[PDB]
C-alpha cells in the first residue's frame, strides 16, 4: 500500500519512527516521509522518499531549561505551524494515491491531513501515553482564533489546550510497555504499547571502550546547553575506573569546558544505542527515548530532568527503582558524585533496570508496531466491503 | 504586492530603508511609508506614498553629556507606540496590504503587523542585538534596581495596555525596542557584527544600504572634485558640539586640500570662529557623495556614518558621543580601520595628532578597504529585497492555498 508518514521536528520523534518505517517497507509498504531538512539523512538511509516541510523551530535546540516559557505563546507557534504544514502537505498530496496516514502523535497536522484525505491514520507516540490526567497571557488572543480556524475548517477538534499535541490516530503506537507507563490501565486497546523501536541508525572510537567499564552521560539533543553540569561531570567522574563517554551536543565546543580528564571521551553526538550496549550507568536528562533506550539495555539511570515530560519520566524511573533523580536545583559536585556512586553501588537499581528492560523488550518493538498498523488497515479494508 | 512600511523618527533609520524601498518598487511593489514630516522629501522622491505620524521627539541637538534613564525611554516609546499604532490603524484599516516592513526599533511596526495579521520584516539599522547585547545597552542607562525606577509601574501599566488592546506581545523590556520580524534585515556584515555566530538565519546580514538620495547635487562638487578631502560630521543627533567644531577650524586650517564640515541644523556657522579659506561649512551635506570623494572621515561613530565611510573604504577617526557609538568605535578599532578619541581625552593637539596619524596611513587605508569589502560583500539593498520577496512568496502561496482548500 501507499503510506503518507508525517514526522515531528525533533530527533526524539524521528528516531523511533525509523524502525517502524523499516518494518513497513520490508512488509511491502511504499512510504512518503515528510520531515524537516535536519533529519533528511535518517530517512533517505531506509531508501524511502523524503519530502520537506518548513522547520518551525528557532525553539528546540541549545536550551538550558532555565528559559522563560509562555505555554500559550508556545501553543500559538504550534497551531500556526499546524495550519502551515497541513496547507503545504495537502497541496502536494491532494491528487496523489495514499491508502493510509502515519504521523507523529505530537504533530496535530498529521491528524488534520488524515481528516483532509478521509483516510485511516495511526499516531506514533514517543512520550508516555497521555490522557486528560497528565493560558491567559499576552499571546492568549491568537491561541483561541487559531484553534477556531483549525476546528471549523481542518477538523482539528481542539477542545482543551492539552488536546493540541494529543492527536490520537485509529491506533496510538506507544514506544513503551504497559510495565513502565504511568496509569497504564487507563489506556484501552487502541494504545499499542510496543516498547522501544530500536534499529541501526545513521566514527566513534569503540577500540577505546572495548574491555572498559563505561559510564555514559548525555542531556539529549535539546536541553544540552549545560556547561556548568558538564564541568561538574569532569570533576565527579575523573577517578572512574573505566571510560566516561560524554555527549555535549552540537553547540558547546569541548575547548569551552575545563580540561578533559584522561578517562573521558567527549563528542557532540555519539551512537547512543551502541554506547548503551556497553554502559554500566547512564546519566540522562530523562528524555523518554534516552530513558527507554537505557532501560531496554538494562542500564540503571541517574536522571536530571530539565523540562517538558522529563519530570514525569524521572518520577517514573524512581517509582519503579531503576534509577535515582537529582533535581537541577540540588545539583552539586558532591550530590552528583554520591548519586552516581549509589546507583552503581546498590545492585537494586541494575536489577530493576533489567526487569523493566525485559518488559520493554517483550512488548515487541518496531515489528509489533508495523504488524498492528497493517492488521488495522486489513480490517478497515475488510469491514469496508461488509 | 501592496507594502506598508513604518519608519523610525531618525535619519539613521530612514536612510538605509531608502535603498530597500527603491529595490522593492523597481520589482513592482506598491509601497506606503509612514514617517515624521522631517523625512517626507527623502520618501516622496522614491515615488512611493509618504504618510505622516506625530513627531514624539530627545533625538536632536544633543551634546552626549545628557544623563538618560532606561525605564524613562521605555515609557516614552511605549506611549508613542500606542499613539502611532492607533493613528496608523485608523488610516489603513480599510486598505489591503500583503505585508509590513518596519524599523526594528519601532514597536508600533510589529503592533500594526499582528493587528493586520500580516507577515512582517524588521530593518535593523544598528548592529544586530540579542539579549546579551540588549542588556549591555540597557545597562548603561540604569542607576539602581528596576523596582526603584521612577517609570517602573508606569512601564508595567503601558505594557499591560499594549498587550491587552494592541496585541503588542511584550514579554521583556527588550521587546519594546527590539521588535524582530519574520526576518530581521541587518545593515552590516557578519564580519563587522559582534557575536555574529550567535545570530541565526532569520537575521539577514546585508551590509550597508547605499543608493542616491534626494538633495544629492545641492553641494558645490566642482570645489572638491580633484582635491584631497577631509570630511567631519557628528551625525544628526549628537551634533551640539560648538567647541569641537571650533577645534576642527583651527586644527585643519593648514590642510593641503578641502575640509567639508557638517555642523547640523541647530548651530549657525555665524556662531563659530572664523572659517578658514579651505572649508565648506554646511548644516547638512549629501554625505554619500562627500564620502565618495573623501580621503578621511572624522565621525561620531554612528552606525550609518561609520558603515557608509567603510563602504567607500575611507579610514576613520571616531569620537563616540552616546548610544551604540562606543561599541561601533570598539569595532572600528578592532578591525584596524580607524582610530578612536575618547571625548574625555579630546584636545586640539590630540585631534590634530589623531587626524595626522590616520591621514595617508597605509595600515588604516588597507584595514578600511578590507572591512569595506566585508561590508560590500553582504549584498546590500538587492539582497534585502530578494530575502523579503522570497518570504512574502511562500506566505502568499500558503494563505491562497488554504483559501482554495476552504
Ligand atoms: O549523543 C547522542 C544524543 C542523543 N541521541 C539520541 O537522540 C534521542 C534523544 O531523544 P530524547 O527523548 O531522549 O530527548 P530529547 O533530545 O528529545 O530531549 C535518542 O533517541 C538518543 O539515542 C543519540 O543518538 N546520540
Ligand atoms: O550632513 C549630513 C549628516 C548626516 N547624514 C546622514 O545622516 C545619517 C546619520 O546616521 P548615524 O547612524 O551615522 O548617526 P545619528 O545621526 O543617528 O547619530 C547617515 O545616514 C548620514 O549619511 C547626511 O546625509 N548628511
Residue numbers in the entry:
A (entry chain A): 2 to 59, 62 to 137, 151 to 218, 222 to 405
B (entry chain B): 2 to 58, 62 to 410
What do the authors of the reporting publication say about this deposited model?
To better understand the molecular mechanism of YojK to catalyze the formation of Reb D from Reb A, we solved the crystal structure of YojK in complex with uridine diphosphate (UDP) and refined it to 1.90 Å solution. It consists of two monomers in each asymmetric unit. Similar to other bacterial glycosyltransferases, it folds a typical GT-B characteristic conformation containing two different β/α/β Rossmann domains connected by a variable loop region (V210-P224): a flexible N-domain (M1-F209) and a relatively rigid C-domain (F225-M405), which can be verified by superimposing the crystal structure of YojK with another bacterial glycosyltransferase YjiC. The flexible N-domain will allow YojK to accommodate various acceptor substrates, while the rigid C-domain contains a typical plant secondary product glycosyltransferase (PSPG) motif (Y288-Q329) with high conservation of sequence and structure, which is responsible for recognizing and binding the sugar donor. Similar to other glycosyltransferases, the catalytic site (H14-D107 catalytic triad at YojK) locates at the cleft region and closes to the center of the sugar donor and the acceptor substrate, and most of UDPG binding sites (except Y288 and D328) are highly conserved. However, the substrate binding pocket is highly plastic and flexible, and a large substrate binding pocket is observed in the crystal structure of YojK, indicating that it has an ability to accommodate diverse substrates, like the large substrate Reb A. With the crystal structure of YojK, we next performed structure-based engineering to improve its catalytic activity for the glycosylation of Reb A to produce Reb D. Probably due to low binding affinity between Reb A and YojK according to its enzymatic parameters, the crystal structure of YojK in complex with Reb A and UDPG was not obtained.
To address these problems, a novel glycosyltransferase YojK from Bacillus subtilis 168 with the ability to glycosylate Reb A to produce Reb D was identified. To solve the solubility problem of plant-derived glycosyltransferases, YojK, a Leloir O-glycosyltransferase from B. subtilis 168, was selected to determine whether it had the catalytic ability to glycosylate Reb A to form Reb D, as it exhibits prominent glycosylation activity to various substrates like other bacterial glycosyltransferases with a large acceptor binding pocket. Then, the purified YojK was used to determine the glycosylation of Reb A. To our delight, it was found that Reb D was well synthesized by YojK with UDPG as the glycosyl donor, which was confirmed by LC-MS and NMR. Based on the catalytic mechanism of UDP-glycosyltransferases in the catalytic process, catalytic residue H14 of YojK firstly takes a proton from the hydroxyl group of the glucosyl unit at the C19-carboxylate position of Reb A to generate nucleophile, which then adopts SN2-like mechanism to attack the C1 carbon of the glucose of the sugar donor UDPG to form the β-1,2-linkage.
